[PDB]
Write an enzyme that holds these catalytic residues in place. Structure first.
Site, mmCIF file in Angstrom:
data_model
loop_
_atom_site.group_PDB
_atom_site.id
_atom_site.type_symbol
_atom_site.label_atom_id
_atom_site.label_comp_id
_atom_site.label_asym_id
_atom_site.label_seq_id
_atom_site.Cartn_x
_atom_site.Cartn_y
_atom_site.Cartn_z
ATOM 1 N N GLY A 43 -94.057 20.655 -69.173
ATOM 2 C CA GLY A 43 -93.967 20.286 -67.773
ATOM 3 C C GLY A 43 -92.649 20.696 -67.150
ATOM 4 N N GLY A 44 -92.006 19.753 -66.465
ATOM 5 C CA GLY A 44 -90.780 20.024 -65.745
ATOM 6 C C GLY A 44 -91.054 20.339 -64.286
ATOM 7 N N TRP A 45 -89.966 20.396 -63.514
ATOM 8 C CA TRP A 45 -90.084 20.553 -62.065
ATOM 9 C C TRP A 45 -90.851 21.818 -61.696
ATOM 10 C CZ3 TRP A 45 -89.421 17.665 -57.852
ATOM 11 C CH2 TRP A 45 -89.344 18.307 -56.609
ATOM 12 N N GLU A 70 -94.513 16.326 -63.504
ATOM 13 C CA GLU A 70 -93.782 15.951 -62.293
ATOM 14 C C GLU A 70 -94.634 16.300 -61.074
ATOM 15 O OE1 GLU A 70 -89.665 17.300 -62.361
ATOM 16 O OE2 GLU A 70 -89.424 16.673 -64.446
ATOM 17 N N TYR A 71 -95.497 15.382 -60.619
ATOM 18 C CA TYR A 71 -95.728 14.028 -61.138
ATOM 19 C C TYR A 71 -97.183 13.691 -60.888
ATOM 20 C CZ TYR A 71 -90.695 13.676 -60.522
ATOM 21 O OH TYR A 71 -89.339 13.903 -60.569
ATOM 22 N N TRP A 111 -79.831 14.965 -68.938
ATOM 23 C CA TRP A 111 -80.120 16.288 -68.404
ATOM 24 C C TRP A 111 -78.807 16.889 -67.933
ATOM 25 C CZ3 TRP A 111 -84.437 19.143 -68.605
ATOM 26 C CH2 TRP A 111 -84.322 20.416 -68.027
ATOM 27 N N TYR A 130 -81.552 9.835 -62.087
ATOM 28 C CA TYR A 130 -80.670 10.804 -61.444
ATOM 29 C C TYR A 130 -81.481 11.458 -60.328
ATOM 30 C CZ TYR A 130 -82.815 13.299 -65.426
ATOM 31 O OH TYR A 130 -83.693 13.786 -66.365
ATOM 32 N N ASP A 131 -80.855 12.394 -59.608
ATOM 33 C CA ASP A 131 -81.446 12.949 -58.378
ATOM 34 C C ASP A 131 -81.804 11.843 -57.395
ATOM 35 O OD1 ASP A 131 -81.278 15.513 -59.535
ATOM 36 O OD2 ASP A 131 -83.353 15.365 -60.300
ATOM 37 N N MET A 184 -85.879 9.034 -65.523
ATOM 38 C CA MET A 184 -85.003 10.067 -64.946
ATOM 39 C C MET A 184 -84.147 9.458 -63.833
ATOM 40 S SD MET A 184 -87.389 13.450 -65.056
ATOM 41 C CE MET A 184 -88.823 12.728 -64.313
#
Length: 375
Positions: free
Chosen positions: A81-83, A124-125, A343, A191-192, A189
């Site tokens: 996965g991932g962004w 995501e997501y 990350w 963060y962000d 996660m």
């Protein structure tokens, strides 16, 4: 049983000079769990290498899992996965029993062939971005995890997830008890929280309320404490809650340089690091070096949020340093959380160019977890 979950953005091998970070730059004793980011899928559920020249032809999967030759207790996972992978194909895969089965079989094949110890799912997501089936994704995600667990238990393999942090995001994607039930741990996660997409400057990972924020309806603000307390409250046991921390900062172009507090009007993304090369984002390795080489920067601590920020004319940068990393891990210790996820390892000051030793952020995490300090 405290753990340190290190994500490795494997495309960092293509950086040049002092930014280049290969598998053999990893210190396998500063992590308990090391995660290879990322593999992907097609809509029919076939797990696949996203950079086969690196992952397969040049043997990068196997070099990564061969870190267990140095630290035999290390667990090495592959993250799907991932962004950049988006949501549509995961939405399609999770809705069809045949595609879920194909994903379980093909991800297992990659895991066993390349000697991984398990799978980290980073969709995501569910029910967000380019989702196809919308709110159905929430159920189908939990069904996928259940079926992965059932198969993986035949091989003693790990199953983990990375999830969105704040309540407003999490309720869109997850049934927390059913997610926690099937995984070894949940990497939240945290963060962000804020970034150059916002209309004002803000911290990437504020622990508590930030300067310039209203205290009414405080539980709705995007910060680490609200996210952790939401997940604990929703049924994630502390021994399955791994708290994310960032080894990067986010950068802004102020609307008016004389107004440079947190929550000041911004006009968009700010500077880029020389190696990460993305306006709005900067690795800790890049920004600690920038601060060290240019004394004109002003560094301040937001003593509400417990994080630093820096400005120089139009540039405004949120980041995390050894001090704020210490506060984060002390917070995690104080709530008996399972550990820390980061990350990502390739933007620590891995060469020690900023004067606090090699891997200052990662060593800080390991030290504060080993010491058990809560304040």
């Amino acid at each position: 049983d405290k753990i340190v979950v290190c994500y490795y953005g494997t495309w960092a091998t293509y950086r040049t000079g002092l930014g280049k970070f290969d598998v053999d730059d990893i210190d396998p004793f500063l992590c308990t769990h090391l995660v290879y980011a990322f593999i992907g899928i097609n809509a029919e559920g076939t797990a696949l290498a996203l950079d086969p020249e690196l992952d397969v032809e040049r043997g990068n999967f196997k070099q990564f899992t061969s870190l267990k030759e140095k630290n035999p207790n290390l667990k090495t996972l592959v993250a799907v996965g991932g962004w950049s992978e988006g949501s549509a194909q995961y939405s399609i895969m999770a809705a069809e029993p045949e595609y879920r089965q194909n994903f379980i079989q093909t991800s297992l094949a990659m895991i066993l062939e390349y000697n991984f110890d398990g799978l980290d799912v980073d969709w995501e997501y569910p029910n967000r971005r380019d989702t196809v089936h919308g709110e159905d994704d929430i159920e189908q995600f939990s069904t996928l995890l259940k079926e992965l667990r059932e198969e993986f238990d035949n091989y003693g393999l790990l199953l983990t997830v990375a999830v969105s942090a704040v309540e407003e995001a999490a309720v869109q994607s997850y049934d927390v008890p059913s997610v926690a039930k099937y995984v070894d741990y949940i990497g939240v996660m945290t963060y962000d929280m804020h970034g150059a997409w916002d209309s004002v400057t803000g911290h990437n990972a504020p622990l508590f309320i930030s300067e310039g924020e209203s205290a009414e309806q405080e539980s709705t603000l995007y910060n680490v404490n609200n996210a952790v307390q939401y997940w604990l409250s929703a049924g994630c046991p502390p021994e399955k809650l791994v708290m994310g921390v960032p080894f990067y900062g986010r950068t802004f172009q102020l609307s008016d340089p004389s107004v440079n507090a947190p929550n000041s009007p911004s006009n968009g993304a700010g500077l880029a690091g020389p190696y990460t090369a993305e306006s709005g984002y900067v690795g800790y390795n890049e920004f600690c070096y920038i601060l060290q080489q240019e004394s004109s920067w002003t560094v301040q601590t937001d003593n509400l949020a417990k994080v630093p920020y820096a400005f120089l004319d139009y540039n405004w940068v949120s980041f995390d340093n050894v001090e704020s990393m210490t506060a984060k891990v002390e917070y995690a210790n104080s709530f008996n959380l399972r550990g820390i996820m980061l990350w990502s390892i390739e933007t620590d000051d891995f060469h020690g160019l900023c004067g606090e030793g090699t891997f200052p952020l990662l060593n800080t995490i390991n030290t504060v977890l080993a010491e058990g300090s809560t304040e």
